[PDB]
Structure 1
Amino acid sequence: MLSVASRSGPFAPVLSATSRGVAGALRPLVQAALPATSESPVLDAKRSFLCRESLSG
């Protein structure tokens, strides 16, 4: 009936024309981050993650 995002877990990539590429829905699922020392590393092809997609205007 429904999407793959409703019954959450299988992932999806996006490409934009003026925005950044996103991977998945529940891949950074949390309370692995409240348990200590979950570091996102420095990258060599690094990206902006908030990526204008939630901007105030």
Structure 2
Amino acid sequence: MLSVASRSGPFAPVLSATSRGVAGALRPLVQAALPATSESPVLDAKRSFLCRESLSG
């Protein structure tokens, strides 16, 4: 009745027609890259960088 996404932590993947594949709700959770360096993906199978947040109008 309350969803998988309502309590945080189980996974969900998404497929689109005109948009990009996504994974999970809280997976990459914040105060992880606050310290050290969590350097990010060195890409070899490049999916996007900002997830279609442009073309706002």
Query: Which band: TM-score by shorter chain?
Result: 0.7 to 0.9
TM-score normalised by structure 1 residue count: 0.85
Q: 1:38 deviation in Å?
A: 0.5
Identical residues among aligned pairs (%)? 100
1:40–1:30 Cα change, 3 Å: same
Q: How far did residue 54 of structure 1 move?
A: 5.8
Deviation at 1:36, TM superposition (A): 1.6
SS at match of 1:4: coil
- Mean Cα displacement is larger for which, 9-18 or 35-44? 35-44
Q: Structure 2: any 5+ residue segments left out of the alignment?
A: none
SS of 2:15's partner is: strand
Structure with greater strand percent: 2
Is 2:45 the partner of 1:45?
yes
| Counterpart mapping for 1:1-57 below 5 A | 1-53=1-53, 55-57=55-57
Moved over 4 A (4+): none
Q: Which runs of 5 or more residues in structure 1 are unaligned?
A: none
Closer/same/farther in 2, CA of residues 52 and 31 from structure 1, 3 Å limit: same
Count of residues in correspondence between the two structures? 57
- How far 1:55 moved relative to its partner? 4.5
